[model samples]
Target: MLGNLKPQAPDKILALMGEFRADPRQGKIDLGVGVYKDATGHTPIMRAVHAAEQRMLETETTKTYAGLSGEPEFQKAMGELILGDGLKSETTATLATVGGTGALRQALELARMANPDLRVFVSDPTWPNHVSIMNFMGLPVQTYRYFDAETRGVDFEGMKADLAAAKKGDMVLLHGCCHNPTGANLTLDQWAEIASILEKTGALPLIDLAYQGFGDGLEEDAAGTRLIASRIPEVLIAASCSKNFGIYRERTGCLLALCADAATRELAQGAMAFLNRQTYSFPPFHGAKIVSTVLTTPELRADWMAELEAVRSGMLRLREQLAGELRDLSGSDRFGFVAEHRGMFSRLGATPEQVKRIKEEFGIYMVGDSRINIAGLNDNTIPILARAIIEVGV
Candidate 1:
């Protein structure tokens, strides 16, 4: 069996990390991966998370197993955090998973269970892992046009035309906020339009929400998810705590399933628990415990929100600086989307050859499809990357 298996395609983000380490260049910059780095080139522990962890360490008694759906406190915190705009708890089922990836995988499983012939629709340029994991699970997927290469923004008309092909019971996977890879996101008005379409089409909306707080402000990011939940009959939201809570290794994430009623929520909840049992048995506790501790306690929650705000603001500043730098260098606002795009990444619409030339010539790294992690930039490196773009750009 092992001999029959072919080599797996290297994860672009993880592969970039290894390449970055192997490079001998003195100041080679890495703009790959979704990891957030401060201006000091460090991914610091958020103050709230650190404090929560400390509290758990001092007060907790044992490493006992938590419920299959994870601690209710974690679910509540994540549910409220992700769906804060009048979330209907009675109609929603929340579960803990290994991570956002796990949550997405399990959501696919649930879709399979609910409708064995279910097909998943994805953005043309979604997080690579979404399709990768779906293929791993033997699930069928279709792609919709999303990003416009020329403007480096969302192609809403094209997306709408593609999504219209969705059948009644198909699943349309949308980025809840801060779309990964492309970085182009729908405005709240656009989300409303999407919600209207989903309502008419009867397509189940499965939202991949990895970078909620990383784009715009926290509340601002939740707007799309909230609109979908309120308007649609149902929604599957897989949210990650890794980026916002800084618990990348803790593998903490939540899957919120919105259904028709309390009875439906209970059934969905049970299925979620069963899925957890069939897979990992139980989700890890430490990350969820930390999140719960911070959220339930007013003081810690305040601290966490403050730190997250700073992180978000810092990234926004980098976007502004990068856009300004491009404008100054080119004497035009053609690259203004660099500022408009919100999140850890911005797909610069550079071709594969251009991306390769960027890595080889300037020692600056971005994804093959030209996705650049804006969080990787700093005051010193902004000008460096800006000039590299101007010099070798296609």
Candidate 2:
């Protein structure tokens, strides 16, 4: 049975990480990988997380099991972090998972258990691994018009039209904020419009919120998700602590299931626990605990927010520098989306040939789809990348 498995295609974004590491060029810019990097090219652990870890080391008495769903503190923290106070006590259930990726897998698994035929509707050019995992799980998937390549913006009309075709009880996967790979997201009004469509069609929503504080402010970024969850009868959110808390290797994430009301909360909890047991038994605890600490403590949360803001603003600065350089080189604001795109990424909408040209000629490594890691560039490299883009005519 093991021999039956054959070689498969690798994920493009992840694959770029390897290519970037293998490159020998000095000062070569790496716009690959989605992990947050500071101006000094470091993915440092947050001060709050380090402090939490230190406290846990001295106070935590047991390294024992935390049950199938992990700690409830994780759930409470995740709920409050994403949905805020009002929706906190109202959330049905939340299960700690390996990471956002694991939460996403678990969400799909539970959805399949609920309705095997409930096809997943994903945006076109979504994180490739999203589609890959859906196929691996033997689920049917449909694509909606998401990113408009021509303008590097969302194709709202096309998205609405495709979503209208979804049958009742279908699952429409959405990026809660700062859409990965593309970095283009709908406005608050558009989210309301999308929510209305989901309500009209009776489709369930699953929001993947990996980058919260990385874009806009935390509250504003989550506003769309909160609006949708507040109105929709049911929903799921895969919340990641990797970017905001800078705990990537810690694998801190939570899977939230919002049911009809409090009456169904216990049942939802049971289902979430069952899914966790079926997958990883129990999620990691240390990372979750750190996240909980920061979210609840007033001082720690404030400090974390300030640091996250600095990181967010750094990316914005780089985006502006890159766009300005491109404008000077190309004599147009055609690439102004770099600044407009909020998050750690910007899909430059370049073809494969152009991407190859960029790497071979300028040692600039971006995802083949031209998705750039905004945090990967600093004040210095922004213009360099911009020049590479213009030199390659992408």
Candidate 3:
């Protein structure tokens, strides 16, 4: 049985991390991984998270198992945080999962259960894991045109045309905010257009919201999701606390399904709970409690918001500085898209060969596709990366 299993291919990002670690260069910059980093090159524990853990340490009473779907408090808090007043409780079914990736897995399972022939439409150049997971499950996956390399923004028209091919009962996966890898997002108007296309095609929208507070303001980041939920009849949302709450190790995330009526909500809720039972008996509780405690406590929530705002502003500053540096060096505004792109990453639009040269010559490590993590840079290193780009004639 053990011999029957074939060796899987290595994950590109993880492989890059290994290669980076093996290189003993003095100042090799790593922009490969997706985790957030500060100017001091550390992923810090937010103040609110620290305080919440302290509170839980003093007050948490039981160590028993939680509900099958997870604690109601966590479900309610996360649902409200992601959708605000966009969805009614009676019409929505929520489930707690190990993390954002788990939420996606469960959501896909639920969709498969509902429609065995369900096909998923994903954005081209999406987070690689999205395709890997779907393919592993043997689910048919299609890609819609998304990133336009020329403008480094969304190709909305091409996306709409591809999405029109989806039929009833199909799933259309969308990035709620801070689109991964490419960092190109659809506008609110474009979201409305997508909603119309989904309605016309009778396809369900599954939104992945992993970086809620990393892009724009918390409320601003959720605008597209809220709009889609308000207009669409059925919607699925997978939200993560890893990025916003800085609880990567805790593995906390939620899956929300908005149904057409109360009866469908009950059915969906029961199926989701069954999925949780079949996969992992009960979801972890510590991280969910931490998130709930921070969100419900007025003082802690305020502090978390403040700290998140500072993180967002710092990333924005780095983007501006990097773009400006490149502009001055190249004597052209070709790199201006870096400043316009929001969130932790932006596709630098460099060829694979250019990326290799940047790594080999300058000790700068980015994904093979030239997707760079904005948070991976700092004040001094920005000029270095800019000069490398110019020297490589990118």
Candidate 4:
């Protein structure tokens, strides 16, 4: 039985990382992996995160296991951070997970427990792991039209039409903000329309909010999710602190299930806790504590927000610079979508051959799908990438 196990397919992003490392070329820029990098190409721990850990070191008294569902403080702080006043404690159930990916897994498990026949509707080009996980769980998954290659933006009409086909008990997965890989997001108005569609179809929404502060302002980024939560009776949110707090290795994230009433909330809460028990039993507490500490401490919270603003604005500046450089090089506004797109990644809409050419001819490394990590670019490399794109006829 042990020998009968099948080999798994290599993850594209991870495979790309390996290739990038093996290239052995100096000045090679890696825009492949999703982690945030500073201007100096370092993934530094945020100031607030370091401070929070320091405080925890000086103050935390127990190393004993935390609650099975996770600490109440973490749930409360994370809930408030994500939903603001939209989160109703009486009707909401929260769970701590390994990371955003773990939150997604538990949310899907809970949804399955609630409705075994439930179908999942995901964007055509969602995070690859979204589809991978669903397939592993043997859940029926459908793709809704999302990215429009021509405009390098959302295909809202097609998306609405595709989503309308989902009936009650179907889970419609939406990227809350700063959509991974593509970085195309729906406007607040579009979110409202989606809410109406969910209401009409009686479909549930599962919002993946991994890059809350990496996009627009934190509040601004959460606007769509909040709108959906208010208008929809049932919503599942899987939020990650990896990017926002720079605590990726600590594996911190939370799952929020907002039911219609207190009774339903209790039932959902039990199911979420049960799912945790069946999986890892207890979620990691260190990262969650860091998040709770920073969010609750006024000075720490302010400093975190300030540093996040700098990270957000710095990415925005890079987007603008890349767009400007491309525009100047191409003598066309075709690449203006780069600046308009918010998040760490922007899908350049390059064909596979063009992507290969850019990678081989130039040391600039991006995913084969042309999804470049915007944070990977600094002022110096932006010009190189822009020129590479144009020279490769992208």
Candidate 5:
């Protein structure tokens, strides 16, 4: 049976990482991976996280499992972090998971258990892995119009038109903020419109909030998610601490299920734990503990926020520099959207051949669809990348 197992295609993003490492170029810029990097090109561990880990190392006495749903403290802490006052403790159930991807997989599995026939509607240019996971799980997936290649902005009308087709109880997967691969996002008013649409359609919302503090401010990024939660009867939130806390290798994340009322909360909670038991049995604890420790401790949380803001602003500066350089070199405001695109990525709207040329000739590594990780660039390389873009006529 083991010998008969077939091979699966490698993840494109991870594959890019491998290719980038093997390039052997001195000045090769890695804009492919989504991990955040500082101006010095380092993905440093946050001070808060390091402090939290130090405390845990000294205080923690056991290496036991974190149980089916992991630590309730972690659940509560992360729940509040993402949902704020909207986290209805009596009506919401959360579980710690392997990472953001684990949370997403568990969320979809729980949804399938609840309503196996419910179709999932995702954005047209969503993270490729989302579609791959859903397909592997035998779930029907459909795409709604999202990014407009010409303007590099959201196509709200087309998105609404496509989402209108979803039936009641279907899942409308949304990027809560800082859309992966494509950084374009829905405005607050557009979020309100989406809330109304969900109200009319009775479709459940599954929000993937992987980049919270990376875009805008923490509260600003969570605004849309909060609005949707307030309007919708039920919502599923998959949040990751990997990016915000800079604990990527530790794999910290949480999955939240919000029910209509307190009465359904217990059932929802049981189902979530049952799913965990069936899958991984128990979630990892170290990362979850680190996150919870930082969140619950006021001083640590404050320090974490300060550092996160610095990271956020640094990326903003890089975006502005890149966009300005492009404008000056190309003599066009066409690349002005880069500055507007919040978060770690901006889809440059270049063709596959153009992207290939960029990598081969300029030693700049970006996603094949031209999605470059904004955090991957520093002030020094911003001008270099801009010149490369112009040289490739992108």
Candidate 6:
């Protein structure tokens, strides 16, 4: 069986990390991986996370498996955090998963289990994993126009036209906030338009909220998602605590199914639990416990919010600086989209060859699609990257 398996395409981002490490260049900057980094070039543990871990160490008694749907405290805390006061608890079903990726996968499984003929409509430049995972599951998938290469912004008109093709039962994957690969996002007004369209088409929204606090702000990021949930009859939300909570290794995430009534909610909830049982069985508990602990406690929650704000502000600063740098160097505001884009990534609209030259000539690494991680920049390296971009004619 092992011998029958064929070679697979290496994950470009992870492969780039390997190439970056093998290079002996001094001061070589890595903007390849999606992980967040501070000015000191470290993914530091948040103060609140450290405190929560300490408390857990002192108080947690056992390492036994948690429930199939995970702890209710975690579910409730995360539900409130993501859905806010408008969340219909009686109509919502939440389950813990391995990570955001796991949640997305299981969400797809649950969706297909309910509607075996379900098709998926994804953004043109969504996270690569979304497309691949759907293909692996043998689910038919199509793309909707999202990023506009010329303006480096969303093609809203094109998006609407494409999404109009979806039927009532189809799933449309939306970035809840902080769109990956291309950081361009829809304004709240645009989100309202999308919600209206989804309502007209009756397509279910599968929101992938991987970077909640990393965008404009926590509440700001959740705003679009809240709108969809309130307006849409039913919704599926796959949320990640990895980025916001700094629990990447812990693989913390949740899958939320919002139905229209108690019966639908119960059905979805049971199916999710059964899916969890068939897959990884019980979910990992440490990260979920840490999240609940931090959120339930007032002081810890305040500390986490403060640190998250700082992280948000720092990235915004980098975006401003990078946009300014590119403007000054190129004598054009074309790259101004970098500042407008929110989240850890900003696709520079550079071609594959240009991206390659950027890596080979300047020791600066970005994804093939020219997606640069804003968190990888700092005061010292910003100018270096700016100059590299100009020299490469990107």
Give the whole-model CA lDDT for all candidates, comma-separated.
Answer: 0.88, 0.86, 0.92, 0.93, 0.90, 0.93
Ranked by lDDT, the better of candidates 1 and 5 is 5
Per-model TM-score, in order, reads 0.97, 0.96, 0.98, 0.98, 0.97, 0.98
Report RMSD (Å) for each prediction in the order shown: 1.4, 1.7, 1.0, 1.0, 1.3, 1.1
- TM-score of candidate 5 on Cα atoms, chains taken together: 0.97
What is the C-alpha lDDT profile of model 4 across 1-394, one tens digit per residue? 8899899877666788789889988978888868998878899999999999999999989899879999999999999999998778999999999999999999999989889998999997999999999999999999999999999999999999999999999999999999988989899999999999999999999999999988889999999999999898889999999999999999999999999999999999998999999998999989999999999999999999999999999999889999999999999999999999999999999999999898889988888888999988887898899999999888
The local distance difference test score of model 4 is 0.93
Clashes of 3: 0
What lDDT score is found at residue 347 in candidate 5?
Answer: 98
Count clashing residue pairs in model 5.
Answer: 0
For 160-247, candidate 1 gives per-residue lDDT tens digits of 9889888899999999888888888999999999988899899999998888778888889999999988898788999998988899
Lowest summed lDDT window (length 10), candidate 5: 8-17
Of the two candidates 2 and 3, the one with more favorable TM-score, higher being better, is 3
| Residue pairs with backbone atoms closer than 3 Å in model 6 (clashes) | none
Error of 1 at 138 (Å): 1.7
Which 10 successive residues of model 3 have the least lDDT summed?
Answer: 8-17
Judged by lDDT relative to the true structure, which candidate is superior, 1 or 4?
Answer: 4
Relative to the unseen true structure, what is the C-alpha lDDT of residue 389 in candidate 4, on a scale of 0 to 100? 92
Q: Candidate 3: where are CA atoms >4 Å away? A: none
**For residues 225-273, could you state the per-residue lDDT of candidate 2 as single tens digits?**
9999888979998888888899999998988889887767787888889
